[PDB]
Amino acid sequence: TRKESYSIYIYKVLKQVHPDTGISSKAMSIMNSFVTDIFERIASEASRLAHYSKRSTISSREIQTAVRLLLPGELAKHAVSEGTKAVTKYTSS
Amino acid sequence: RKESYSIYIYKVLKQVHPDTGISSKAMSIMNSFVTDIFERIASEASRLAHYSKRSTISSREIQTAVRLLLPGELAKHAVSEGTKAVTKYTSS
Amino acid sequence: KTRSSRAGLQFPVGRVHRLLRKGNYSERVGAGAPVYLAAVLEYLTAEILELAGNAARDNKKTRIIPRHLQLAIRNDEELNKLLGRVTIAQGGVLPNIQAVLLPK
Amino acid sequence: AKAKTRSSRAGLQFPVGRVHRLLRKGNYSERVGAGAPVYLAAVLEYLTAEILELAGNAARDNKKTRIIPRHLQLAIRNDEELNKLLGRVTIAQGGVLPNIQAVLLPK
Amino acid sequence: PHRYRPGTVALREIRRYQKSTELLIRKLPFQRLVREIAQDFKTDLRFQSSAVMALQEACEAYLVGLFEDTNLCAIHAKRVTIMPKDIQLARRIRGERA
Amino acid sequence: PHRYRPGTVALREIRRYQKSTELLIRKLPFQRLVREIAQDFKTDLRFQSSAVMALQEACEAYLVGLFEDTNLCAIHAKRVTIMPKDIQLARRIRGER
Amino acid sequence: RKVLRDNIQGITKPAIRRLARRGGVKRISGLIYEETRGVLKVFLENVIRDAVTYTEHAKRKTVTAMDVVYALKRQGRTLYGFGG
Amino acid sequence: NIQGITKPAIRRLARRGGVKRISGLIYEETRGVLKVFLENVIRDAVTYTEHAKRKTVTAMDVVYALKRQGRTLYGFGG
DNA sequence: TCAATATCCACCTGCAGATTCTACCAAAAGTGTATTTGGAAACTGCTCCATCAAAAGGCATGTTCAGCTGAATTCAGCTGAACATGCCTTTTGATGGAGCAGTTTCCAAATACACTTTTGGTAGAATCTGCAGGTGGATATTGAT
DNA sequence: ATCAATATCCACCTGCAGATTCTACCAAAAGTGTATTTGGAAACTGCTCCATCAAAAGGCATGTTCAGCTGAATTCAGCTGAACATGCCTTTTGATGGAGCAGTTTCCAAATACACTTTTGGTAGAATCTGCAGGTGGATATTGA
Ligand SMILES: [Cl-]
Ligand SMILES: [Cl-]
Ligand SMILES: [Cl-]
Ligand SMILES: [Cl-]
Ligand SMILES: [Mn+2]
Ligand SMILES: [Mn+2]
Ligand SMILES: [Mn+2]
Ligand SMILES: [Mn+2]
Ligand SMILES: [Mn+2]
């Protein structure tokens, strides 16, 4: 019956910005719903973006262009920087 | 390349109005319409299956999707034609 | 000997099936799903065309143009609700003037 | 060769693997690139950092150390961007921003 | 005897409820309404309390938002009292009708 | 010398335009505007003719609708003259603001 | 069980007044209370109808919070706080 | 360029909208709403253009943008 | 009502821009097999939902009473409609040229796969503690004089 | 400008309901060695997408008049807010019984995989055609008198 959640990571990220703060469980589930929601919106747009350009594979480029569509810059412009960053760091194996 | 339901729409046009024709724009509009509803029903069907952890989109998912998407009487008749076509088909 | 004719439809049952698989909607597609979905699509198409045809007729026309599709949709509560967030290009609007704005 | 989580290889807190799986099992596309789960895990991580930063402050302001729903609301609603992003979202137990139209005050 | 003028407690109440987040409709009556509507839809149904709570949170979030808009239509008509015609215009413009 | 009373030609126009479907914004100025805006997003762009047409269609349908709602707000305030205050209220209730 | 009737009246004048307050409303016309019950009933019927549809499709007899969340999402009124 | 959208043009739109009397200030208000609308739509369209690695905005780029804004347009490829 | 503008409104009429109609080739669509396997059916372990009981007080009901708000009227300043002029910018109709979507044709970089070890997480016990709720003076905030 | 009357604050407290940690697996990431593709990269077209040219034709920009619409100013019936007295019925706590989710297994009917074999659907000319766009000539609809 084990079920997956983002709680673990949401909490880690919480400790990073505000080391002193905690979070009630309602707040946490709320936060969970937010993560799975934007994941759904990004993925879907990514999915469609891939279709339009006759591709059967969703690259980091589809995610990027999707992010630019769903988010309002500034939020967009900063999300794209972090994504580019995390990827190149990754490609540096 | 570029396939459309254009031809299938014209047949349907001739059944309800053998007498009537249809402009170019009117035909593309009916084409956008078919692809749109096709996409709404299929998508809702996609989710419905994932909610029940099923790997296949059966006519049961198509029907619920229809019930969720088509309003009132449209949904009713849509559902009637639907199971009817699945019957006159499973008959051979 | 096509599944369409077999199901008694004018709509491409075979294509609807291919379009369901290539659509990334699910791992597997049931045998009847494309038949059903194809039936639903044909029916709604017949519905609109049926009303659009009537709109043309009344306009003294034999060819259904975009305006006729618009008149058929916006004058039917069910269809209007379904296509509530859709604009029909070159379809115009229903003639309707608020009472208060009338003379005298 | 020791195990190096992709999250760490990417410099992230969010689960790159998990995200990579949710992608292949979500029927979003035939195949998923290697970078895809990394870029998404980053964006998803950037955003939750952004709302927790503001939520935590709304908490501090209201003299509490634990973030609750109402703090998420003030954080979201008081931020133009987050507000637009979550424009059609209702946060349970979040309440509303205190706001009284001028015309209504004692004259 | 002391007596606040009409409008002062009303403003007090706005400040008070805009500050809080608890549900404003009573639990039991609402649970009933849900069961009554659901039942006249499909018999032998059951609800997780969670499910009833999700419906209450949504209905209240919805009615509260409808009243913000209703209030703007009232003001716009140079009034300060909301009326049915205000709720109707907000719903018309919102697309909940036409 | 003949002269129709104020508002009579307005009603005449309403009936005419609610009866047709032709675009009401001049095709050229619109196209100029569309490219001006686009240049601000990506320089040196080409536009399929139909791309510009799709945009004018949506753009005009959007405005006509907004004017319907705006007119309702004006009527709601016991008027017959739409005002910015009316466009603003409609856009607010609509969620565009 | 017991017959359910008129439960829409379980939505009192004071509960509606409170909702208007949080919505920032200062003065309420006598007729608002019945328009509100009417409006609430339509809202609830639609969400319950879709929710019960997700339930039946899952061959269950119990409406779960998820059914409601999904129903609400269909109507374009996404809810956070019950996804689990 | 926004002035290209002229008073008479706006009156016409309003008329189709069923508007009888138009306040003198509606013309400038309209141009502003129209430019925000276009900016949003084109911005998304052009994003679709760039993703497809083209230099030409196609009608489909506009059709997909409109759907993203919830303004589905029929008769141009969808 | 009388009369004089302008507006609409059928009935016919003649081509031109589209439609509908034809004549053909591939790429889906139907097939005959040979496999995979998803998930309906069959249990049954056990959370959770429907119920019941009882007591307590937070709150919904009803009724009084009169402040001040919405609805009616009036009246006139001036904004926005109707128009005749005068004129500029949109149409539109080929020509020609050229940027460039759309197609092919490769294939090396990048993925999907199939197993095999290794952890990273999730499900409860075991521990910790913000803060919900109560109290009480300190301070306004209102509203009558 | 005073102040009574009341409501709003804010710091001070203390158990315990709701977080946090501590532990243990075990389902699923990370590690590697193959069996396929895919998505880009060049190369070339044939499209259609600018650019001009260049008249005519409306359709837009002004300036005039003044009709009638929107406010501003006044009133007043009575609607709807503030308070109070009553006592109902929603809350809160606890405890069950068993309806009916959920978790596992079992395994055929059903869907996926080739490898082919036809047939149908998209193309680009060929053969008609529905309405537009005029043209009157005839009742209307407006509006001044
Ligand atoms: Cl099936
Ligand atoms: Cl990638
Ligand atoms: Cl009313
Ligand atoms: Cl204004
Ligand atoms: Mn009582
Ligand atoms: Mn008043
Ligand atoms: Mn005057
Ligand atoms: Mn470990
Ligand atoms: Mn053929």
Residue numbers in the entry:
A (entry chain D): 33 to 125
B (entry chain H): 34 to 125
C (entry chain G): 15 to 118
D (entry chain C): 12 to 118
E (entry chain E): 38 to 135
F (entry chain A): 38 to 134
G (entry chain F): 19 to 102
H (entry chain B): 25 to 102
Sentences from the paper on this structure:
The basic repeating unit of chromatin is the nucleosome, in which the histone octamer, containing two each of the canonical histones H2A, H2B, H3 and H4, binds and wraps about 145–147 base pairs of DNA. The human histone H2B variant TSH2B is highly expressed in testis and may function in the chromatin transition during spermatogenesis. In mice, TSH2B replaces the canonical H2B in early spermatogenesis and promotes a stepwise nucleosome-to-protamine transition. Consistently, previous biochemical experiments revealed that human TSH2B does not form a stable histone octamer, although the stabilities of the TSH2B and canonical H2B nucleosomes are similar.
In the present study, the crystal structure of the human testis-specific nucleosome containing TSH2B was determined at 2.8 Å resolution. TSH2B formed a dimer with H2A, and the two H2A–TSH2B dimers were symmetrically accommodated within the nucleosome as in the canonical nucleosome containing H2B. A substantial structural difference was found around position 85 of TSH2B compared with the H2B structure. The Ser85 residue of TSH2B corresponds to the Asn84 residue of H2B. The TSH2B Ser85 residue does not interact with H4 in the nucleosome, but in the canonical nucleosome the H2B Asn84 residue (corresponding to the TSH2B Ser85 residue) forms water-mediated hydrogen bonds with the H4 Arg78 residue. Therefore, the local structural difference between TSH2B and H2B does not affect the H2A, H3.1 and H4 structures within the nucleosome. The structures of the Thr33, Ile42, Ser61, Thr68, Ser76, Ser91 and Ser125 residues in TSH2B, which are located within the histonefold domain, were compared with those of the corresponding residues in H2B. In contrast, the other TSH2B-specific amino-acid residues did not induce any significant local structural changes in the TSH2B nucleosome. The water-mediated hydrogen bonds between H2B Asn84 and H4 Arg78 in the canonical nucleosome are not formed in the TSH2B nucleosome. This local structural difference may affect the stability of the TSH2B nucleosome. Most of the TSH2B-specific amino-acid residues exist in its unstructured N-terminal tail region, suggesting that these N-terminal residues may function to recruit TSH2B-specific nucleosome remodellers and histone chaperones, which could be required for histone exchange during spermatogenesis.
